[PDB]
Amino acid sequence: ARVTVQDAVEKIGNRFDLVLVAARRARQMQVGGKDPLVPEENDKTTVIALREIEEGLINNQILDVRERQEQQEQEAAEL
Amino acid sequence: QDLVVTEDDCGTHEGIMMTPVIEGGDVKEPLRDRVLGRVTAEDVLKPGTADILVPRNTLLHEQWCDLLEENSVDAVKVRSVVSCDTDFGVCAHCYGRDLARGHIINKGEAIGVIAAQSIGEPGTQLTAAAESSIQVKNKGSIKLSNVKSVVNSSGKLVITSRNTELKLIDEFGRTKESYKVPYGAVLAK
Amino acid sequence: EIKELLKLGDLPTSGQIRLYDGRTGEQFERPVTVGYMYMLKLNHLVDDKMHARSTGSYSLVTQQPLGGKAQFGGQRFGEMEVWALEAYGAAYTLQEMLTVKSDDVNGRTKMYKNIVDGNHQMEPGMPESFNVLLKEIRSLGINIELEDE
Amino acid sequence: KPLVGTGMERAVAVDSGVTAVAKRGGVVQYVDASRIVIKVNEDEMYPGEAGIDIYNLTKYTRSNQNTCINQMPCVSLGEPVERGDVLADGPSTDLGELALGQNMRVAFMPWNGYNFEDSILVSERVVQEDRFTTIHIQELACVSRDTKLGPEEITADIPNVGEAALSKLDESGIVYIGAEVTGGDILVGKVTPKGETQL
Amino acid sequence: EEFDAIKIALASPDMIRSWSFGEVKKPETINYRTFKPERDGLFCARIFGPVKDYECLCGKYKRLKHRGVICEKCGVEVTQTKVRRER
Amino acid sequence: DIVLNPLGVPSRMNIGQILETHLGMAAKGIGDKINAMLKQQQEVAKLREF
Amino acid sequence: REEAVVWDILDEVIREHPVLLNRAPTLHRLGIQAFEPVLIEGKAIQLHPLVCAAYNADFDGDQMAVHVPLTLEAQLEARALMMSTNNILSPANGEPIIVPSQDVVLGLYYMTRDCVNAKGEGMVLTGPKEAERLYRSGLASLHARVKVRITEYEKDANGELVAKTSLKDTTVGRAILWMIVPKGLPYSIVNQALGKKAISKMLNTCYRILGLKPTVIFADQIMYTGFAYAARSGASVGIDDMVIPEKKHEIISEAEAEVAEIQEQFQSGLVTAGERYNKVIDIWAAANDRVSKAMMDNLQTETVINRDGQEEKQVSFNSIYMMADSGARGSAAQIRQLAGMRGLMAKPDGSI
Amino acid sequence: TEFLKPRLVDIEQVSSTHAKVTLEPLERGFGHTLGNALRRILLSSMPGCAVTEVEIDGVLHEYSTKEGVQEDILEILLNLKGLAVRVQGKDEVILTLNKSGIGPVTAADITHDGDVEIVKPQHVICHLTDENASISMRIKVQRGRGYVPASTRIHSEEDERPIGRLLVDACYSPVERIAYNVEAARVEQRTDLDKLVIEMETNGTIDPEEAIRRAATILAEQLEAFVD
Amino acid sequence: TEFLKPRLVDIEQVSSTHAKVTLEPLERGFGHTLGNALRRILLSSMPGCAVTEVEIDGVLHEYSTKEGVQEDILEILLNLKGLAVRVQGKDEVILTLNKSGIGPVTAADITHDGDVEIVKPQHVICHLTDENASISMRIKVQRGRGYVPASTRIHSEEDERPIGRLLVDACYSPVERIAYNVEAARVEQRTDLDKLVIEMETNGTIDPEEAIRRAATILAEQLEAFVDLR
Amino acid sequence: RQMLRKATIVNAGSSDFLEGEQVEYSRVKIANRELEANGKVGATYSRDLLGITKASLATESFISAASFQETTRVLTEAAVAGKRDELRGLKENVIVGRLIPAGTGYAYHQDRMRRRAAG
Ligand SMILES: Nc1nc2c(ncn2[C@@H]2O[C@H](COP(=O)(O)OP(=O)(O)OP(=O)(O)O)[C@@H](O)[C@H]2O)c(=O)[nH]1
Ligand SMILES: [Mg+2]
Ligand SMILES: [Zn+2]
């Protein structure tokens, strides 16, 4: 969260993987301009990803599943 | 530098038997605090061998440790880094708790560096000889392990062993105080 | 002799006084030692010591930033400081400090452009100090090659 | 001066040489914020040369650590003085005694962590009274060299420069005496001959 | 470039020749007057590369247009000055 | 003027600063008496006595 | 040009952006920590007291390196792994390093410590709020021994917290500190006179029962209350603070005629240089301990406090004694050479 | 004079009892000037009602024990200190509490009385153990201000004092806690400028927002003697 | 509310600088409430007049030395900080000081301007050694409040930089010292009723009486904001 | 554990052990696991203690050995052996300015090791 990131560690577990997953999500919002699931409330992309992980919306597996979905939609469009 | 947590569980039963540092009467370092946050090896129950109390690879939390003290367990084989089978690193279970986090160590943590730093720091930062008579603090019976002494014309037991360990046993039969007797000593009893 | 002198001043022999807090007006709950200490302002003024750097000139051979405030220098990230990042997790912070922040010439300009572009992406490379090391070992007549994937 | 001293204070101030001390003594003929002229007494005054000592005082000069060296006159106009009396005080000297800093009303007691580990809590009154206000004189040089392309010019005529900047430089390209300056202001204008003009 | 490993081995006389772009015959560094690199000296531009980006020594070829164009007259390759750190 | 921390004395074992402070106040005590007598003019005889 | 709009933009960038602070020497990993920066006017870096332990930071001119983690990844590794809050326990031993001292511990000690009767001994209050109101009203000392009604919250077998109300025999000050204490903890934690040693245990206990955010808030609260009551008190040093044992010269003159008798016996014939060296060192070493013990028995206690009628003995509120007993700064050893006897000094050879 | 006035900005009302009040912008030093001045009035000068005297039948002094009652008389009195009372018209009212049987005696068992209003009728006073036990008392509520203890009441008032009348502390003040925090209000230009955060905590007889208004009013009433 | 207002009772004026002010009757606790609140405004907020700019002819900067003058320009400026000035009408007045010959230059040598009043005419500014020496300067006195150092004033406006003006500190604040004592006012019935004794020590300018009136005014102005807006 | 890294070997297995070669314990255990399943010549071993300085120079990364101490000697012995450093350790990766094989980098580094199996 804002202050401390303990809760988001408790969702995923490995501090190291927490950082990778929060990084990947923050990159989506930074570059892709992906819309945040929680109200922004003037928060940086680093903190928003941690909010989304805390509440259990963002996760390595979930991100991978939606990557496949958008990627398959684009394959559909190209063919 | 190379030592990193590579595996979660090597599934080895090996364990460094750690005893309570009881040197100089007052227990210097308790066994509870010496095995606090370390994976246990071998289903070690209570005195009465008929029902398992503790399992195998199980993180010793402050709660488990408090149970250990009611039963007064003296010796515990615990899983250690040295006896870990993992090739090219060590297992989260052989190590135990990341003392800085207060829970089981995360795989990928650079343990060796932390070890070297933590041994090195105190040294770098840190940069009464009236021991004549042993007087015993609590009543009990004299236990002399490793001792070969000769009786002198006084009536008294004059020790002639080099390694001499006087211990203070209670009633139930636990070791509670230690006292390094030297060579050339007169024992009262 | 000091207490005798204090009595001549009609000041207390203890040299402790009743003090009142300027903020609240209430008294402090016990007597406080007050008097005159001769104090010195040493040459170490903060004005002279504060220094900060984002990007600057870079060293001739090693291509790392210079040292010292007079040369507009980056702070030295020493072995000791590196080990701290090793103990933690922090692998990206470390690589940053090794590469786009020091030698990596292409990397530092590319990442500067990314930070103004607001990309906050590293794109690492090869530290020029290492390229030098290779050249210095080949100058000794030792073949040191990079073996490819 | 130091209120709680030892007595070495005066010895050090005199022997350091930074104080002007009277060799001959006699009565002071003329004080000035620059000079002291003393008329010598007949008993030490030799009958050969004119018996008037002149001590020129050093005014506000740079030290090696860029601190300030200033001599002020101690005595008043028409004061009788003996041999070995202090005529002018050096930089960190009171009437003859050595004065390295400033004594202050101090109280030993915690504040709201504003004196945590040796941290010091000071009154605004100290700043107001300009006690521990310190004077520093820095020396900057501008060198006109001769290069393979040709000699460098110290003109006020400098390519790509605001009138704001050139206002402070006079005809030759030198800043005026008394002029206040801040980082980036030009002190001595200098231009260097460039060979290749390829753009 | 991204590689797997690094190996170290004794340099063959012929291996050493491979890296070389010429034999420095003379101790001459630069000319005292035109502070430019001397013939087949220690700072020879003909061997180590051009002093200035995409510019030969005698100055006949300039600008990024001329790329790898070894000037016939002085014998200096028109590439970046960076090369003189690697050759 | 200045508020210094008591805890930076007994560990440091420089007790000189405290004696300097007590004497410093006594010195200034007598300066404050002379300042008071000079503000009220008073007698040269009385100043001389004190 | 440092235009006014630029400051507003800079404020916006620094928001939620962590910065690394480093102090030399970096002996262990806590020599680097991440913080969220707070823009301040002035040229000095402001460091949080409680982390000064990890850095071995004391403000007599130490400096620190600042480093900016640029990438999103580096920002996340700083916020999650390297943040001050997240590195509370040391990597070496389980004991934590983050713990206030000095003024902070001094203020807590003064309040917690209870004196004889004082203002309003043996009153009864409805909770810590009546206590606070009494103290601030000026009808009660912080050290008044009065019974108050406090409601502690003990955790049950599950996640639910059980509430328990009981009368406690503590002091006004400790009741008011209970207000800072989060629900879960026992009242017995604040009921002793608190020092730095007890407060470290308090924060560790709170961390293992309640968790991270509560201990973070609780740590801040302890710092604020500690400073606040630290300036409300105002203990200091003096010249009479250092008490000297009355029976010091009696133990000095005895020891001194004794050593004299052995020096006269030296010319006689019972003594080598080594034997007499040992005998004189033994005599002075025992004298030193004697004078130190008598000095510590005239300083620790030796408080004649007339209780509500007759005389009592209680612990001394002598300033230096409180500093030493609280563990705020000097130890008994430093007070041995302050008001006691300096002792036997050892030559550079190591011989005494 | 470039006078720089503050204005009441945010009123977080966490509860009817607890309410935080941020205040800006304040000039340097006015944070503590206004903070403390108000804190002192709000503690020692906010007026209110409180139990002064209690007379229980079959009780000669406060140290005895009544059978069928778990709490000693002292503990009962301490609960009556916490009894929240409003008197509308009169300055002094004597309320009667008669109750019997097994159960927690609450403040609702007090005989109403038209003008008097008991803010917390569920307030615990006594626990009755045996059903045959009955408790009867006459509780005197006076209006005053600040904190007037029995120790400061016996030393000043030495008039009528018969045995049996149990005197308890009377916390007239409706404000239970008050603390003010000065935080930096980084202001358009001034960094010296601060905000005042007053964290108030009453019982609910007086509104925090109204209590602050009253405290400032008392302060300005004292400044009428100094003309402007 | 049996409200109980104090009224200004006794004004002992020990000197033009020092003045004691007893105040009664005060209700219990209002002694310290008013005492400190007033002390803080009287130290930080008090309005006054003080020397802001000085321009001496033949003087480019404050570090030079003028011939025939014992004191360096810095020391002269520090003496002008201590110059006690009242401006009646205008906010900013420029006084002229021209003096020659041997003598201690006093404040009386300034051309007495009509509205402006120099409180201490004997105030020493300069010592002239040589008879041929003459000093001429134009001293600007501005009205403000608190403490405005030359360093805080060298980082704000500075629209024009006339090589020849010297900025010096000017303590606008007339109040040098203030302390308040709460004594018991053994009131007809109440013994907790108290008096407030304010010992003020100013330099020149502000009248003690007038200053207390102004400080109470500023506090009451600040309370209008809280009594009004909720 | 790092002190007890190396071990001397007696006899031969299916690899090149013979009398008294000093090889790391992990690598001889790997050999012994495949040997016990398949058979071949069994190899008796004996763990050796190395005190810190020598243990660090005995590491099979010469970039870590060189960076530590004795750089001239380390590089002659590596140059003559034609030794190949695959950059397994942390010091090795820090020198080339790469991601550490630990903490954050352990995820990425394990992905590269599986990229060695195919593509
Ligand atoms: N790293 C380093 N630290 C130094 C050096 N010289 C002094 N110090 C530190 O400077 C500090 C000076 O004393 P303190 O740190 O205040 O000592 P302390 O442990 O707080 O004990 P007290 O003085 O009794 O409060 C010590 O922590 C030293 O470690 C140096 O050369 N290197
Ligand atoms: Mg220290
Ligand atoms: Zn050419």
CATH code for the domain in which residue I131 is found? 2.170.120.12
Task: State the Cα–Cα distance between residues I73 and I169, nearest whole angstrom.
Answer: 14
Quote the CA–CA distance of H75 and H82 in Å, as a whole number: 11
**Which of J29, J64, J103 is nearest residue B109 as measured by Cβ atoms?**
J103
Residues in chain F: 50
Q: Which fold has domain J52-118?
A: DNA polymerase; domain 1 (1.10.150)
Backbone phi, then psi, for D67, in 5-degree steps? -85, 180
Touch test H–B: 3 Cβ pairs or more under 8 Å: no
Question: Are C96 and G43 an interchain contact pair (Cβ–Cβ within 8 Å)?
Answer: no
Question: How far apart are alpha carbons A24 and A42 in whole angstroms?
Answer: 20
Q: I144 phi and psi, to 5 degrees? A: -155, -155
Q: Report yes or no: I212 and I198 within 8 Å, Cβ to Cβ.
A: yes
Element (H, E) at F37: helix F16-39
Is the same domain home to H154 and H182?
no
Closest CA to G89 of G203, G184, G197: G203
In this complex, the residue of C131, C147, C149 whose CB is nearest that of residue E6 is: C147
**G350 Cβ neighbours under 8 A, 6+ residues apart:** none
Split into its structural domains, chain I has a count of 2
- Give me the half-sphere count of Cα atoms (radius 13 Å) on the Cβ side of residue B34: 18
Spatial separation of the C-alpha atoms in residues E46 and E21, rounded to whole Å: 9
In eight-state DSSP terms, residue C65 is B
- Structure method: X-ray
Closest residue on chain B to A14 (Cα): B106
- Structure-block tokens of residue G134: 């009494």
Helices G103-112/G196-209 angle, 10° precision: 90
How many CB atoms are closer than 10 A to CB D97? 20
Tokens of G2: 């440092």
Torsion of CA H70, H73, H78, H82, to 10 degrees: 80
CA angle D150, D155, D158 (to 5 degrees): 90
G58 lines ligand 1 (CB under 6 A): yes
Answer yes or no: do I88 and I35 share one domain. Answer: no
DSSP at C73: P
In CATH, D18-92 is 3.50.50.60: no
Q: What phi and psi, each to the nearest 5 degrees, are found at residue B124? A: -70, -30
Three-state secondary structure call for residue G222:
helix
Tokens 């941690």 belong to A50
Spatial contact of I227 and H217, defined as CB atoms under 8 Å apart: yes
**Residue I218: Cβ within 10 Å count:** 22
Alpha-carbon distances of J14 from A56, D130, J24, J28, J36, rounded to whole Å: 53, 87, 17, 11, 11
- Rounded CA-CA distance B10/G332 in Å is 51
- 3 state SS of H81: helix
The 3-state secondary structure of chain B reads CCCCEEECCCCCCCCEEECCECCCCCCCECHHHHCCCCEECCCCCCCCCCCCCCCCCCECCHHHHHHHHHHCCCCEEECCCCCCCCCCCEEHHHHCEECCCCEECCCCCCHHHHHHHHHHHHHHHHCCCCCCCCCCCCCCEEEEECCCEEECCCCCEEECCCCEEEEEECCCCCEEEEEEECCCCEECC
Distance CA C104, CA C117 (A): 20
**Cβ burial D166-183 (10 Å sphere, 16+ → b, else e):** eebbeeebebeebbeeee
Instruction: Kindly provide the residue ranges of all beta strands, DSSP E only, lying in E1-87, ordered along the sequence.
Output: 3-10
Name the closest ligand to CA E78.
3
Q: What is the DSSP letter of H224?
A: G
Distance of CA B74 to the CA centre of its chain: 8
CA dist G79 and G36 (Å) reads 8
Phi, psi of A30, rounded to the nearest 5 degrees: -70, -45
Q: Which amino acid is at G136?
A: R
For chain B, the chains sharing at least 3 beta-carbon pairs closer than 8 angstroms are A, C, G, J
Residue range(s) defining the domain that contains residue H148: 48-172
Q: Are residues H97 and H161 in the same domain?
A: yes
Amino acid at D105: R
What is the C-alpha separation between I145 and I142, in angstroms, rounded?
Answer: 10
Cis geometry, peptide bond prior to residue B122 (ω within 30 degrees of 0): no
Whether residue I171 contacts residue I78, with contact meaning beta carbons closer than 8 Å, is answered with no
CA G257/CA J1 separation, integer angstroms:
61
J83 with E7: Cβ contact below 8 A: yes
User: Cα separation of H24 and G304, whole Å?
Assistant: 52
Backbone phi, psi, residue C132, to 5°? -65, -45
Record the tokens describing residue I123, joined without a space: 């105030």
Q: Greatest CA separation found in chain H?
A: 75
β-strand pairing of B141-145 with I170-171? unpaired
Query: How many angstroms separate the CA atoms of H107 and H124, rounded?
Result: 7
β H124-128/G65-67 pair status: unpaired
**SS3 at position I79:** helix
Contact assessment for residue D5 and residue F20, using Cβ atoms and an 8 Å cutoff: no
CB contact at 8 A, D57 and D38: no
Tell me which long-range contacts E20-28 makes (C-beta under 8 A, separation of at least 24).
Answer: E21/E47, E21/E48, E21/E87, E22/E46, E22/E47
Strand, helix or coil for residue F11 = coil
**Token pair for residue B137?**
């603090």
Closest C-alpha among J117, J92, I65, G293 to residue D57 = I65
Both tokens of J82, joined, read 């034609």
Chain D: nearest CA to I156, how far in angstroms? 14
Q: How many helices (H) and strands (E) does chain C have?
A: 6, 3
- Scanning C20-39 for CB atoms below 8 A from F yields 33-39
The answer to whether G40 and C56 have CB atoms below 8 angstroms apart is: no
From the centroid of its chain, how far is CA D10? 22
Q: Which of residues 79-98 of C touch F (CB under 8 A)?
A: none
For residues G66 and G24, the answer to whether their CB atoms sit within 8 Å is no
Specify the pairing of strand D102-108 against strand D86-89. unpaired
Residues I117, H68: Cα–Cα separation, whole Å: 85
- Give the three-class secondary structure for A8: helix
Give the closest residue to C94 by CA, choosing from C107, C83, C104: C83
D33 near I66, Cβ under 8 Å? yes
- Resolution of the coordinates in A? 3.9
> Any idea which fold A1-79 has?
Eukaryotic RPB6 RNA polymerase subunit (3.90.940)
Distance CA G196, CA G58 (A): 17
Half-sphere exposure of C2 (CA within 13 A, CB side): 16
3-state secondary structure of G75: helix
| Alpha-carbon distances, residue C60 vs C73, C129, E43 (angstroms) | 14, 11, 16
Q: Is I227 helix (H, G, I), strand (E, B) or coil?
A: helix
* CA–CA separation, G141 and G111 (whole Å): 9
Listed in sequence order, the DSSP H helices in G210-318 are: 212-232, 249-268, 273-297
| Separation CA J58–CA I29 (nearest Å) | 80
Q: Are G187 and G151 in contact (CB under 8 A)?
A: no
CA distances from G26 to C68, D34, G32, G82 (A): 20, 54, 7, 14
Which residue in the block uniquely carries the two structure tokens 């010992």? Answer: I199
Structure-block tokens of residue G133: 């109101």
Amino acid residing at I41? I
Q: How far apart are CA E7 and CA J83, in angstroms?
A: 6
Domain locations in chain A as residue ranges: 1-79
Which residues does chain I have within 8 Å of residue D164's beta carbon, measured at their own beta carbons? none
For residues G172, G177, G179 and G184, what is the CA-based torsion angle, rounded to 10 degrees?
-120
Judged by CB atoms closer than 8 Å, whether chains meet at C5 and F24 is answered as no
Contacts of I53 (CB under 8 A, 6+ apart): I139, I140, I165, I166, I167
* Pair (H54, H151) in one structural domain: yes
CB of B45 closer than 8 Å to CB of B58: no
Q: In the numeric block, which tokens belong to residue E2? A: 């991204």
Query: Which tokens belong to I230?
Result: 């909720």
CA B134 to each of CA B161, B182, D72, G123, I173: distance values in angstroms, whole numbers, following the listed order: 17, 10, 75, 51, 75
Q: How far is CA H217 from CA G169, H227, I30, I222, in A?
A: 40, 16, 14, 11
From CA C18, how far away is CA C32, in angstroms rounded?
Answer: 7
3-state secondary structure of H179: strand
CA distance A61 to A53: 12
What is the Cα–Cα distance from B147 to B165, expressed in whole angstroms?
8
> Interior CA angle at G86 toward G84 and G87, to 5°?
65
Q: How far is D112 from chain I (nearest CA, A)?
A: 19
Is the domain of I85 the same as that of I165? Answer: yes
Is the CA virtual torsion C47, C52, C57, C61 positive or negative? positive
Q: Is the dihedral of CA I209, I214, I215, I217 positive or negative?
A: positive
Whether the Cβ atoms of residue H216 and residue I222 lie closer than 8 Å to each other: no
Around ion ligand 3, residues with a beta carbon closer than 5 Å are E 56, 58, 60, 71, 73-74
What kind of architecture, by CATH, is found in domain B132-189? Beta Barrel (2.40)
Query: What is the rounded distance in angstroms from the CA atom of residue D193 to the CA atom of residue D142?
Result: 16
Selection from H5, H46, H216 nearest residue I223 by Cα: H216
Q: What is the DSSP letter of J22?
A: E
Minimum CA–CA partner of A19 in chain J: J104
Q: How many CB atoms lie within 10 A of CB H202?
A: 25
CB C53 within 8 A of CB C65: yes
C-alpha to C-alpha distance for C11 and C17, rounded to whole angstroms: 9
Q: Are G228 and C23 in contact (CB under 8 A)?
A: no
Distance CA I159, CA G266 (A): 90
Neighbours of G306 (CB within 10 A): 10
**Which CATH class for the G239-352 domain?**
mainly alpha
β-bridge pairing B186-187 and I117-118 = unpaired
How far apart are the two ends of chain E, measured CA to CA in Å? Answer: 18
3 state SS of C19: coil
C-beta separation of F9 from F15 below 8 A = yes
Q: Which residues contact F49 (CB under 8 A, 6 or more apart)?
A: none
Q: Retrieve residue B131's tokens.
A: 């021991």
State which amino acid sits at residue J106.
Y
CA angle in degrees (0–180, nearest 5) for A21-A27-A32: 130
Smallest CA-to-CA distance from D119 within J8, G44, I134, G30 is with G44
> How far from C82 is each of B108, B113, C107, CA to CA, in Å?
17, 11, 20
CA distance D161 to D184: 11
Ligand 1 pocket residue status of G61, Cβ below 6 Å: no
Alpha carbon distance H93, H86 (integer Å):
10
Three-state helix/strand/coil letters over I95-117? EEEEEECCEEEEHHHECCCCCCE
Q: Say yes or no: H103 and H8 in one domain.
A: no
Instruction: Provide the token pair at E64.
Output: 């990024």
I115 and I38 within one domain: no
What atom of ligand 1 comes closest to residue G25's alpha carbon? 1
Contact residues for G154 (Cβ-Cβ < 8 A; gap 6+): G161, G162, G164, G184, G186
The upper half-sphere exposure of residue I9, i.e. CA atoms within 13 Å in the direction of its Cβ, equals 13
- CB distance G238 to ligand 1 below 6 Å: no
State which amino acid sits at residue G325. D
Is F22's CB within 8 Å of C38's CB?
Answer: no
What does residue B69 show for φ and ψ, rounded to 5 degrees? Answer: -75, -30
Q: Which distant-in-sequence residues (6+ apart) come within 8 Å of D53 by Cβ? A: D22, D23, D24, D26, D37, D38, D40
**Is the CB of residue B159 less than 8 Å from the CB of residue B185?**
yes
- 3-class secondary structure, G65: strand
Range of C146's domain? Answer: 64-149
- Determine the Cα–Cα distance for residues I3 and I27; give it in Å rounded to an integer: 9
Distance CA H226, CA A24 (A): 67
- The C-alpha R_g of chain I, in whole angstroms, comes to 22
Chain centroid, CA C52 distance in Å: 9
Q: How far is CA B96 from CA B74, B105, G346, I133, in A?
A: 20, 6, 46, 89
Only one residue has tokens 């720091």, namely B121
Å between D182 CA and nearest CA of chain G: 12
DSSP tag of G89: B
Whether residue G186 contacts residue G170, with contact meaning beta carbons closer than 8 Å, is answered with no
Nearest alpha carbon to residue G209 among B100, A2, B102:
B102
Q: Separation of F15 CA from ligand 2 center, angstroms?
A: 16
How far is the first Cα of chain J from the last one, in angstroms, to the nearest whole number? 35
Which of G58, G196, G334, G335 is the best mutation target for the ligand 1 pocket, counting ligand atoms within 8 Å of the beta carbon and taking the most? Answer: G58
| Cα D14–Cα D19–Cα D24 angle in degrees, nearest 5 | 80
Which atom, in ligand 1's list, is nearest to the CA of F11? Answer: 24
- Tokens coding H160: 């009528």
